[PDB]
Amino acid sequence: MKFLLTTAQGIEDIAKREVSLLLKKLGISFQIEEKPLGIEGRLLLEAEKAYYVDEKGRKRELSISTYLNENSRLLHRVIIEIASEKFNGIEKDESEEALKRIKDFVSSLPVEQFVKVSETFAVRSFRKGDHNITSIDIARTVGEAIFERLSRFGTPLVNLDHPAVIFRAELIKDVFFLGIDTTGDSSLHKRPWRVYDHPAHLKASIANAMIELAELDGGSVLDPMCGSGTILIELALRRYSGEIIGIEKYRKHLIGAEMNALAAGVLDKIKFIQGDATQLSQYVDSVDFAISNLPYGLKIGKSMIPDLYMKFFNELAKVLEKRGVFITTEKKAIEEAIAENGFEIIHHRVIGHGGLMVHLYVVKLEHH
Ligand SMILES: Nc1ncnc2c1ncn2[C@@H]1O[C@H](C[C@@H](N)CC[C@H](N)C(=O)O)[C@@H](O)[C@H]1O
């Protein structure tokens, strides 16, 4: 059986390792492709069905979708795949030749075997790249064809806001995807603990991607520019055995982070300090790790950020024992701050954070 698993662009390999460790525990055989068909923010999972013997002595299925929904920290959506196809030249086909290609394609799909003729259903679409039709055209064309198809078999029941079964149709570049979205209208990154909403907060999946890349070992972990608290809370909710510390310049944000941590059940295990990271060595003497989503300093200045990174990183030099994991839009400010201060890049990545192409670096001190 086949699942399309989504996550942030540029973290597919991290999401893969995450997915394996999890399914291995079930005993399942499976195989996982990064970026099926070249599309980013995706994994195509192939597994055998997960059977056990139940209380009645009967073969019973274990939901793999449920298992992943419940336990993954990196995934956005778990979708049961019905088909994945390239439509050559679609975004360059004219509006009506496009809807045409779609409907005829979907009309062929045995969609009745994925939904009970008599469950409710909606379509939700995601469209992307340059096309001649809208995202709304897809939900429309795809919806027509599911409804028409299901009719042959009975009485189709449509419900936009409270479906029991969401079909999701994605068209990205020239790749079309149709599937059953098991995750729902709220994507997995939408955390219940997030009661204070930071204007520049880290998407929780990318937070765990930073945690993984750090290769933590029980040593103390610091978010010097913590904000809303995302990175530290994710790490506490992973049950991390080490000290966890967050420093945040602005009180409002820091009290937000404490409220977020209260709502997540982990406020006890994080030490939250109002404080200024360019004076870092006043707040601490030693930390094994530092993990931060740095302020991107949008707009200009005329030179705000270069100077912020330069000081912070000089302070960091003073206290860091193992590794730093950092995220920023400001490629230049960061790499000079890194260079001038005797840090060494041991990993660099590009990631899609919401809609911006962010840089992620892993660093150590040179002389270590
Ligand atoms: N000199 C400084 N020292 C410490 N923190 C700072 C300093 N300058 C800015 N900050 C904070 O850095 C934080 C960076 C945020 N982008 C972090 C978002 C956070 N990762 C979250 O998910 O909620 C901002 O909330 C700023 O208040």
Side-chain angles (χ1 to χ4, degrees):
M1 195 165 125
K2 279 175 184 186
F3 304 86
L4 170 60
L5 321 177
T6 66
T7 191
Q9 324 195 168
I11 66 180
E12 303 84 357
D13 65 318
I14 283 279
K16 184 172 149 151
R17 164 169 191 109
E18 154 79 332
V19 168
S20 310
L21 296 201
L22 282 173
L23 299 165
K24 269 185 184 342
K25 291 171 188 176
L26 291 194
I28 280 305
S29 196
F30 67 79
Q31 68 262 8
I32 299 179
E33 198 196 354
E34 299 177 40
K35 292 174 212 188
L37 293 185
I39 307 302
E40 298 216 34
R42 293 185 175 170
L43 311 156
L44 155 71
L45 163 68
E46 325 189 56
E48 34 163 63
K49 288 186 179 298
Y51 304 107
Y52 58 102
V53 167
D54 74 353
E55 65 289 22
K56 293 189 218 163
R58 290 183 197 184
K59 179 177 63 54
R60 276 191 84 122
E61 254 189 282
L62 191 272
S63 188
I64 305 194
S65 75
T66 300
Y67 182 63
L68 296 193
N69 287 313
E70 304 275 350
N71 295 304
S72 179
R73 291 258 175 216
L74 276 317
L75 307 175
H76 297 178
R77 278 165 164 116
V78 183
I79 300 161
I80 300 154
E81 186 211 345
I82 301 162
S84 297
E85 276 306 326
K86 317 249 302 159
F87 295 28
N88 265 89
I90 177 80
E91 42 181 343
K92 120 179 199 179
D93 268 0
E94 302 298 330
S95 64
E96 279 121 40
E97 160 79 326
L99 309 167
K100 167 76 163 153
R101 284 179 82 168
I102 304 304
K103 201 163 101 93
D104 281 350
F105 183 70
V106 176
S107 282
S108 282
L109 307 176
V111 152
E112 55 277 8
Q113 333 273 344
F114 283 97
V115 317
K116 300 213 97 178
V117 71
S118 66
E119 282 156 319
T120 301
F121 76 92
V123 180
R124 303 280 191 241
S125 63
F126 176 81
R127 190 201 56 81
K128 168 161 214 220
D130 324 312
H131 298 90
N132 286 3
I133 70 175
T134 77
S135 160
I136 303 91
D137 291 319
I138 314 302
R140 293 182 183 174
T141 314
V142 160
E144 288 163 274
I146 296 176
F147 193 78
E148 266 173 274
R149 165 105 176 187
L150 270 58
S151 285
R152 296 182 223 179
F153 291 91
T155 321
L157 320 177
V158 176
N159 179 319
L160 306 315
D161 314 323
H162 297 190
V165 205
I166 285 156
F167 287 87
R168 175 158 189 108
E170 295 208 45
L171 180 75
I172 305 175
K173 289 195 236 212
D174 253 346
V175 182
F176 180 77
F177 168 86
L178 176 60
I180 295 327
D181 187 7
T182 66
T183 296
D185 280 327
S186 303
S187 158
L188 292 173
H189 65 71
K190 278 283 191 227
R191 305 307 217 239
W193 58 250
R194 202 189 296 283
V195 293
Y196 171 85
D197 181 345
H198 198 291
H201 81 250
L202 187 56
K203 190 168 237 158
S205 47
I206 305 181
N208 281 260
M210 297 182 80
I211 299 288
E212 297 287 341
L213 288 167
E215 300 172 5
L216 293 176
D217 59 25
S220 64
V221 169
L222 163 69
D223 197 334
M225 309 201 353
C226 75
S228 172
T230 308
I231 286 170
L232 294 188
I233 290 176
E234 288 289 323
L235 182 54
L237 289 176
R238 293 165 72 109
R239 311 303 202 119
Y240 193 57
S241 62
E243 283 167 52
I244 308 180
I245 316 161
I247 301 170
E248 161 57 57
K249 205 208 209 177
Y250 301 92
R251 185 103 208 156
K252 182 98 152 46
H253 281 154
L254 173 71
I255 298 296
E258 268 153 336
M259 171 186 274
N260 284 355
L262 191 62
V266 289
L267 166 54
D268 280 354
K269 46 192 187 148
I270 302 172
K271 174 182 196 137
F272 274 123
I273 310 181
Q274 202 197 346
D276 182 317
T278 64
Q279 268 80 358
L280 186 50
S281 60
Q282 313 291 113
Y283 299 91
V284 297
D285 172 50
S286 192
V287 284
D288 284 340
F289 300 101
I291 298 164
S292 198
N293 173 213
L294 299 176
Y296 309 151
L298 303 191
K299 282 335 253 185
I300 187 131
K302 189 132 211 97
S303 55
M304 267 291 169
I305 295 307
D307 302 334
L308 180 54
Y309 293 13
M310 201 63 225
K311 297 118 151 159
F312 165 56
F313 269 99
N314 177 75
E315 286 303 305
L316 188 52
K318 300 182 176 176
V319 314
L320 188 56
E321 306 295 343
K322 311 218 185 163
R323 300 180 278 292
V325 187
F326 295 104
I327 268 182
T328 185
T329 53
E330 304 308 296
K331 190 184 184 301
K332 209 258 203 258
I334 216 184
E335 299 180 349
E336 262 179 17
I338 282 285
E340 299 273 325
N341 289 283
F343 281 85
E344 171 194 345
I345 302 151
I346 55 184
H347 180 73
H348 165 264
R349 201 178 262 253
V350 166
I351 299 159
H353 181 223
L356 303 177
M357 292 306 104
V358 169
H359 289 282
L360 173 155
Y361 295 90
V362 185
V363 303
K364 65 184 265 280
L365 282 149
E366 205 171 60
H367 59 279
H368 298 172

